[PDB]
Amino acid sequence: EDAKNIKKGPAPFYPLEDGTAGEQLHKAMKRYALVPGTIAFTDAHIEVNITYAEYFEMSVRLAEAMKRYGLNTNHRIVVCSENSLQFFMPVLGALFIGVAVAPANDIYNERELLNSMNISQPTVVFVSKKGLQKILNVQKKLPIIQKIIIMDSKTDYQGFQSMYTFVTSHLPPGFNEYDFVPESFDRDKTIALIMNSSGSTGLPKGVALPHRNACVRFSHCRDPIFGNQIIPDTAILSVVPFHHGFGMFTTLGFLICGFRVVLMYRFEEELFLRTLQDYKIQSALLVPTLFSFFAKSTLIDKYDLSNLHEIASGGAPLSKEVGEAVAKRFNLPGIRQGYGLTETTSAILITPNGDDKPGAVGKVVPFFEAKVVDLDTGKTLGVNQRGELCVRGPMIMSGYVNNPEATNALIDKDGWLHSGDIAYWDEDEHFFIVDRLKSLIKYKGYQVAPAELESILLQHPNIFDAGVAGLPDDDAGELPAAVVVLEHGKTMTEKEIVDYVASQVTTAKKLRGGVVFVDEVPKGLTGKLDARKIREILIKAKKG
Ligand SMILES: Nc1ncnc2c1ncn2[C@@H]1O[C@H](COS(=O)(=O)NC(=O)c2csc(-c3nc4ccc(O)cc4s3)n2)[C@@H](O)[C@H]1O
Ligand SMILES: C[C@H](O)CC[C@H](C)O
Ligand SMILES: C[C@H](O)CC[C@H](C)O
């Protein structure tokens, strides 16, 4: 019964607000829409702005239109789109009236899209042009779908209503957005978002997240230590996908704060620096796969970045060395980190403002607790000991949609979620993520972490990107091996790469598995490495 080994989150600076997530969003955005010149979203590519006034008015119109159409808390809508200025209009609209929103990944193949909508069971589908065809090819197998609406069109498009013509079909005469009152409902039992889970074998799952979870996020995002201070005329640059929890709940919190969310979809070094300069960006929110595009640029000094105070990263490991280098080049105290799972709604470990520690992902957020347990007996471990990370609090998902068995396998009766990650916490209660548990390698009954070897590989100059896994061998079970994309203009050989690896490792950690040179390492949208795909590639090196 040792609670000295359970890391607890401090009390929030602000007490948790009442109301549904829709009510808190509506309140904040109405306030900002009544302040002249407030911009909610800016497309940095085409240089188009949308004010909080227009965004509020259109979200309210969508809420009333869906309500008049007949949607209520028994229904769900899908939002299938690349990032854009229109993404959050139907999301906010649905949140205002208690309709659950299921974002479907825009780059899903039709099979994965069918899975997502089979779980969410949407009545109405909001889809960009780029995604329409896939929706159609899937729609035949989901009779629950009664209405398809195009998001990035002003007129009807190819026989489908756009959000504007839909709204016009259902709004009453003389409707005034500022007299609209969002629906009230049980914030613990009404689902706000159904997100799709990642990483795990098999088809993704439906992660049901009630309004309560969004409300706790809205506590965090305006917290002076675990969030961002609400100061007028603040611009954020976001390059994170909106259908994913990392894009969803950061962007929602940014709206709660009245920030200006500046969007890039194609990431290039010079366009990034121009955008930071011209929009006076104070914080850039990134995934680590984008860092290489500017970490060693020579242009940084040619741009005025005096407004830039923060670079935040999330969704996957960020190299300590890359992070320290980038933080020092932009005069930053560090790269701010956030760790979360789709199943925890958002980051439940955040680097607190003013308390950076390089290589860590932060401390436990308010309302949450975290522990590290033994992989074989589940016993809680103590300081600086590695084990599985467990977390519990009011942003844990209510459960997987129609899958109670998976829910109970993930979350125990005390509410602890078993993250699947190896971590530890230090004397000051900072957490470090070591690796994914299902990606450890067994040399001779000793656990080798592929992330450590990757970081070492990544040190090298001739090595642009690396991914490590296990190649199967009847001796040792699996030997550790790599997949290496080299820097342009480099000659490195498998012999001298395994030798450089031997130079900074113990006995079992030696890369006795070889190297398979590649033109790119298989990553995900947030840049998690595809361990199954790396093992797959590690077959040509199994050949003779
Ligand atoms: N920060 C991190 N550092 C190292 N590894 C990280 C990581 N985050 C996720 N991971 C990995 O993603 C897996 C979780 O996978 S997941 O399905 O895709 N869910 C997520 O990745 C997820 C949901 S929310 C969220 C974040 N919200 C934020 C808000 C602010 C901020 O500054 C950073 C973040 S991250 N990330 C983790 O288990 C882990 O392996
Ligand atoms: C306080 C909140 O707005 C109401 C949610 C309860 C559970 O109905
Ligand atoms: C605030 C204004 O919209 C920025 C315009 C320049 C071109 O970025």
DSSP assignment of 177-245 equals GGG-------TTTSEEEEEEP-SSSSS--EEEEEHHHHHHHHHHHT-TTTS----SS-EEEE-S-TTSH
CA atoms of 492 and 517, how far apart (whole Å) = 10
What single-letter amino acid sits at 410? Answer: L
466 has which bridge partners? 484
Longest CA–CA span in the chain (Å) reads 77
The half-sphere exposure of 285 on its side-chain side, counting CA atoms within 13 A, is: 25
Residue to probe by mutation, ligand 1, list 209, 213, 238, 246, most atoms within 8 Å of CB: 246
Comparing CA positions, the residue from 321, 333, 322, 331 lying closest to residue 293 is: 322
* Whether 68 contacts 227, CB under 8 Å: no
* Whether 305 contacts 334, CB under 8 Å: no
| Residue 100 parent element (H or E) | strand 100-103
Q: Whose Cα sits closest to atom 8 in ligand 2? A: 186
* Whether 431 contacts 425, CB under 8 Å: yes
Q: Whose Cα sits closest to atom 11 in ligand 1? A: 316
Interval between CA 44 and ligand 3 midpoint (Å): 9
State which approach was used to obtain the coordinates: X-ray
70: alpha, beta or left, given left = phi > 0 and alpha = psi -120 to 50?
left
Interval between CA 265 and ligand 3 midpoint (Å): 17
List Cβ neighbours of 514 (8 Å cut-off, separation of 6 or more): 471, 481, 482, 494, 498, 538, 541
Comparing CA positions, the residue from 357, 325, 489 lying closest to residue 429 is: 357
* Whether 213 contacts 124, CB under 8 Å: no
Interval between CA 525 and ligand 3 midpoint (Å): 28
* Whether 225 contacts 13, CB under 8 Å: yes
| Structural domain boundaries enclosing 481 | 437-542
Core vs surface per residue 329-339: b (16+ CB within 10 A) or e:
ebebebbbbbb
169: alpha, beta or left, given left = phi > 0 and alpha = psi -120 to 50?
alpha
Q: Whose Cα sits closest to atom 4 in ligand 2? A: 19
Tokens of 245: 């929890």
- 379 burial class (0-12, 13-18, 19+ CB within 10 angstroms)? exposed
Interval between CA 150 and ligand 1 midpoint (Å): 30
- 504 burial class (0-12, 13-18, 19+ CB within 10 angstroms)? exposed
* Whether 434 contacts 471, CB under 8 Å: no
Catalytic residues: 217, 244, 342, 442, 528
Ligand nearest the Cα of residue 350 is 1
* Whether 339 contacts 361, CB under 8 Å: yes
* Whether 31 contacts 232, CB under 8 Å: no
* SS3 letters across 436-503: EHHHCEECCCCEECHHHHHHHHHHCCCEEEEEEEEEEECCCEEEEEEEEEECCCCCCCHHHHHHHHHC
422 has which bridge partners? 388, 435
Interval between CA 112 and ligand 1 midpoint (Å): 21
CA atoms of 225 and 489, how far apart (whole Å) = 44
- The residues lining ligand 3, judged by C-beta closer than 6 Å to any ligand atom, are 47, 49, 278-279
CATH number reported for the structural domain that contains residue 512 in this entry: 3.30.300.30
Q: What is the resolution of this structure in A?
A: 2.8
DSSP state of 288: G
CA atoms of 48 and 133, how far apart (whole Å) = 27
Q: Whose Cα sits closest to atom 1 in ligand 2? A: 18
Distance of alpha carbon 494 from the chain centroid: 35
* Whether 108 contacts 134, CB under 8 Å: yes
- The residues lining ligand 1, judged by C-beta closer than 6 Å to any ligand atom, are 198-199, 245-246, 250, 312, 314-317, 336-342, 346-347, 361, 419, 421, 433, 436, 526, 528
Q: Whose Cα sits closest to atom 2 in ligand 2? A: 19
Interval between CA 18 and ligand 2 midpoint (Å): 6
* Whether 422 contacts 434, CB under 8 Å: yes
What single-letter amino acid sits at 121? Answer: Q
Comparing CA positions, the residue from 253, 318, 317 lying closest to residue 283 is: 253
Q: Whose Cα sits closest to atom 15 in ligand 1? A: 341
List Cβ neighbours of 119 (8 Å cut-off, separation of 6 or more): 102, 194, 196, 205, 206, 401, 402
